[PDB]
Design a protein around this ligand. Structure first.
Ligand SMILES: CO[C@@H]1O[C@H](CO)[C@H](O)[C@H](O[C@H](C)C(=O)O)[C@H]1O
Length: 147
């Protein structure tokens, strides 16, 4: 793991230090606080707030009832079609490890050592330069492994 960031302040917005070529890993460790409604990891084209930066990959756990993960893409401030994963491995009051692997045609996401979902590229991964983490979550560390 390279360019490791420890105990960032949330919301975190930071520049990904190298290109997201296939085989690249983003490793995020943290825990979900007890009153958590949702949080999100956003892979962004830039960090502009107005107009809001495009989000190539929105990864968004929600914690109401059984919960879900919602994945989507924001282009010119418009959300596309949602892809919802109902079998969530996140729970309130539990620690997690998210590993996002970038492949040629999609992201693959594993949580706590177990494959969770695939998400097909809607924007070219070469446009992504910014990692954003927002909402009710505590991040212990963020690390990269570049191919
Ligand atoms: C129809 O709810 C929207 O769903 C979106 C996901 O497609 C996204 O999760 C939005 O969350 C917040 C408001 C955001 O990051 O803009 C939410 O309001």
């Amino acid at each position: 793991l390279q360019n490791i960031i420890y105990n960032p302040v949330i919301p975190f917005v930071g520049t990904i230090p190298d290109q997201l070529d296939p085989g690249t890993l983003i490793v995020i460790r943290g825990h979900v606080p007890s009153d958590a409604d949702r949080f999100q990891v956003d892979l962004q084209n830039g960090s502009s707030v107005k107009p809001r930066a495009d989000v190539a990959f929105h990864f968004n756990p929600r914690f109401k009832r059984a919960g879900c993960i919602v994945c989507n893409t924001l282009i010119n401030e418009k959300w596309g079609r949602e892809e919802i994963t109902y079998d969530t491995p996140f729970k309130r009051e539990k620690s997690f490890e998210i590993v996002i692997m970038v492949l040629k045609d999609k992201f693959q996401v594993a949580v706590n050592g177990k494959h969770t979902l695939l998400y097909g590229h809607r924007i070219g991964p070469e446009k992504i330069d910014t990692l954003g983490i927002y909402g009710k979550v505590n991040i212990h560390s963020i690390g990269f492994s570049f191919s």
